[PDB]
Design an enzyme around this catalytic site. Structure first.
Site, PDB file in Angstrom:
ATOM      1  N   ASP A   1      13.636  75.770  52.484  1.00 24.27           N
ATOM      2  CA  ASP A   1      14.662  76.325  51.611  1.00 24.27           C
ATOM      3  C   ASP A   1      14.081  77.056  50.386  1.00 24.27           C
ATOM      4  O   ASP A   1      14.797  77.272  49.399  1.00 24.27           O
ATOM      5  CB  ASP A   1      15.709  75.250  51.228  1.00 24.27           C
ATOM      6  CG  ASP A   1      15.138  73.939  50.693  1.00 24.27           C
ATOM      7  OD1 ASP A   1      13.925  73.691  50.759  1.00 24.27           O
ATOM      8  OD2 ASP A   1      15.979  73.106  50.212  1.00 24.27           O
TER       9      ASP A   1
ATOM     10  N   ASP B   1      16.203  66.368  51.347  1.00 22.89           N
ATOM     11  CA  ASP B   1      15.049  66.053  52.194  1.00 22.89           C
ATOM     12  C   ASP B   1      15.336  64.940  53.195  1.00 22.89           C
ATOM     13  O   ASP B   1      14.690  64.868  54.248  1.00 22.89           O
ATOM     14  CB  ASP B   1      13.855  65.607  51.336  1.00 22.89           C
ATOM     15  CG  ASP B   1      13.380  66.659  50.362  1.00 22.89           C
ATOM     16  OD1 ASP B   1      13.876  67.817  50.414  1.00 22.89           O
ATOM     17  OD2 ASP B   1      12.489  66.319  49.528  1.00 22.89           O
TER      18      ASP B   1
ATOM     19  N   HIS C   1       9.264  72.120  53.796  1.00 27.43           N
ATOM     20  CA  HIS C   1      10.667  72.474  53.579  1.00 27.43           C
ATOM     21  C   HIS C   1      10.860  73.983  53.664  1.00 27.43           C
ATOM     22  O   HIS C   1       9.965  74.759  53.313  1.00 27.43           O
ATOM     23  CB  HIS C   1      11.205  71.902  52.256  1.00 27.43           C
ATOM     24  CG  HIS C   1      11.033  70.420  52.163  1.00 27.43           C
ATOM     25  ND1 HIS C   1      10.851  69.755  50.969  1.00 27.43           N
ATOM     26  CD2 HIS C   1      10.974  69.476  53.134  1.00 27.43           C
ATOM     27  CE1 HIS C   1      10.675  68.466  51.211  1.00 27.43           C
ATOM     28  NE2 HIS C   1      10.768  68.267  52.514  1.00 27.43           N
TER      29      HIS C   1
ATOM     30  N   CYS D   1      17.632  71.689  46.926  1.00 27.29           N
ATOM     31  CA  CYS D   1      16.941  70.420  47.173  1.00 27.29           C
ATOM     32  C   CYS D   1      17.678  69.246  46.544  1.00 27.29           C
ATOM     33  O   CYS D   1      17.669  68.136  47.087  1.00 27.29           O
ATOM     34  CB  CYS D   1      15.532  70.453  46.592  1.00 27.29           C
ATOM     35  SG  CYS D   1      14.460  71.610  47.404  1.00 27.29           S
TER      36      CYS D   1
ATOM     37  N   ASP E   1      11.564  66.234  58.089  1.00 29.41           N
ATOM     38  CA  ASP E   1      12.372  66.210  56.879  1.00 29.41           C
ATOM     39  C   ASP E   1      13.589  67.102  57.098  1.00 29.41           C
ATOM     40  O   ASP E   1      13.480  68.197  57.671  1.00 29.41           O
ATOM     41  CB  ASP E   1      11.596  66.740  55.670  1.00 29.41           C
ATOM     42  CG  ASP E   1      10.620  65.729  55.080  1.00 29.41           C
ATOM     43  OD1 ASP E   1      10.266  64.751  55.766  1.00 29.41           O
ATOM     44  OD2 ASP E   1      10.203  65.933  53.922  1.00 29.41           O
TER      45      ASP E   1
END
Lengths: 358, 340
Positions: A241, A112, A239, A343, A190
């Site tokens: 992913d 992140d 995010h 992550c 981020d």
């Protein structure tokens, strides 16, 4: 130079892995409450407090540390050098001239906080006030890499005034266009709202990444890189992913609920779009900040070997059928810390060079 | 692009000027006490008022000379702030834009400053920075330092040697002066070797940074020590610089040795050295702003072929700067060149 990573799949040589020790719960305001569908808000708002200051339950940290250790054992057995970040004082309060919070968050999610672009580590200008000092646990490693030749830059540290957040925010209606809680007051992003494919990088707007932040990264990288912005259908988006995951040259894994494949950037037409299977499985934990799409948060050790979570049986089967070699690991105890394998890592060195793939 | 400045002398089009409003006195510990001949105390309102008046006449001179002058945002320097490792009672002020940012061509770089009280000093400039970025400027930050106790030598004593350690990269922008493809810098009580090495790497594609050795035990910022005035003309402080030990590349330039001031600025609060007269600002290769009581400097610049423009500014000295400190030249008409 020990820092060298241009994409998500080149042969992994060295990785930073996160730590759950000393971890503090996410703060509800003014961002994270919007990562919950309205029907989950009642439970989440009892657990999470306004500006932090509440630790994760010790037993949750302990179980996650155990699965983290097995994940690291797999990485090492597969020939990867692992750098374990050491915890720091996430419990400590801090303050700026304009605002204060009761604690930080944790160092569970290196992905992140930093982008690795070739030989450069970039510190993200993060919108979440409680994460203002999250880079601190990594500074020993960063100074080591800089001494050995790495480039190391920061986006300007944001002010995070109230003007950066829409305090009248409401989720859009099913028809309406997407919208998120951050405004266009100042650049924020981020790093995990982006995934890397050599000269082409894919990102999204989210509850923490705005157009100014994307514009900042495109200008910083304009000599060599092109950033393409996808539209997420996830109202809770934060995010990328679990939405869009490059696995290998010509192969990209896509979330069937968050992505309309027919509206994807046209550059992707030359690649195979691998549509993720449905998990038929909701992870459970005593705090429940899970998304069922956590199975997409895989980590590639090269173009073939992929770490994937043990209960994600549909993903494991699809990956095998698509020609990959899954390496299974139990890791659902990490999910309450808001990440899985991708992550939890920063791939600082993958053997390779800068190419265009499309 | 609106940000375009490669040296200290190309024709000046746009400048950010400092502000003394809301200023808090400098904290003695752990840096500033070693630089004089945790905050929480405001500057006397009378000191701010007199400085504000002279600042307005400096601005008037700049505007009368065709320069666009940008003013910063008033902010709360009185507010305390804290990190996980330390806290301070207040910030400092926005009187010295030159300390906080470096302008390298079309790029504004936010310095990793060693002084904990100046951690948020860029905040007064952020509306302007966002405007310039919106108009095409590059805008970068050095990694923001942690400023743990390890960054400072608390048991320091004068001997060269300075208070900042080598724990992490720190520099103030004003420890550097710009000569196109070549930049000159110094170690100081706030700029260390890691900081210089960071900037060298950041700028390695187009720029070379040469480090001079200061003889000033109180060294803090280079713009009373070494001051490029025009191609081939550099003003040097005879007490702070051994001219025989200057970087080899300066061989081809004329070294203009500053005259002695025979004058100590008179103020209730006196924190700058008698060499403040070197802190001049070039409006092009000829026009130079210089302080009215600096009569030897005025004469020397005239004899050297410059055109002095005089301004009363000693009331700004308690805020730790003069004309060069009080400005950030964001646009000068010109391109990147080599002058050596």
């Amino acid at each position: 130079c020990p820092v060298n990573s241009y994409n998500e799949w080149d042969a992994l040589e060295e990785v930073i892995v996160g730590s759950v020790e000393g971890a503090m719960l996410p703060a509800l305001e003014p961002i994270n409450k919007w990562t919950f569908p309205l029907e989950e808000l009642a439970s989440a708002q009892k657990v999470l407090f306004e500006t932090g200051g509440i630790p994760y339950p010790p037993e949750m940290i302990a179980v996650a540390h155990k699965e983290l250790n097995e994940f690291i054992h797999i990485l090492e057995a597969e020939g990867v050098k692992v750098r374990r970040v050491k915890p720091v004082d996430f419990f400590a309060s801090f303050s700026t001239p304009a605002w204060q919070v009761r604690s930080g968050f944790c160092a569970a999610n290196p992905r992140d906080v930093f982008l690795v672009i070739g030989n450069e580590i970039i510190e993200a200008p993060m919108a979440d006030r409680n994460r203002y000092f999250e880079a601190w646990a990594y500074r020993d490693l960063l100074k080591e890499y800089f001494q050995a030749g790495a480039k190391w830059t920061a986006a300007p540290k944001p002010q995070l005034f109230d003007a950066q957040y829409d305090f009248n925010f409401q989720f859009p209606q099913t028809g309406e266009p997407s919208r998120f809680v951050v405004t266009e007051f100042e650049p924020t992003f981020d790093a995990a709202d982006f995934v890397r494919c050599g000269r082409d990088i894919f990102g999204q707007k989210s509850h923490v990444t705005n157009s100014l932040g994307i514009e900042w990264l495109q200008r910083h990288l304009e000599d060599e890189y092109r950033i393409h912005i996808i539209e997420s259908q996830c109202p809770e988006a934060l995010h990328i992913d679990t939405t869009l995951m490059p696995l290998a040259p010509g192969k990209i894994l896509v979330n069937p609920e968050f992505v309309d494949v027919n509206k994807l950037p046209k550059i992707l037409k030359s690649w195979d779009i691998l549509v993720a299977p449905y998990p038929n499985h909701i992870p459970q934990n005593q705090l429940r900040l899970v998304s069922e799409w956590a199975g997409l948060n895989v980590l590639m050790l090269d173009e073939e070997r992929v770490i994937v979570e043990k209960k994600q049986e549909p993903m494991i089967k699809a990956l095998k059928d698509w020609g990959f070699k899954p390496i299974v690991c139990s890791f659902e105890s990490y999910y309450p810390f808001l990440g899985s394998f991708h992550c939890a890592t920063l791939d600082v060195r993958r053997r390779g060079t800068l190419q265009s793939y499309f």
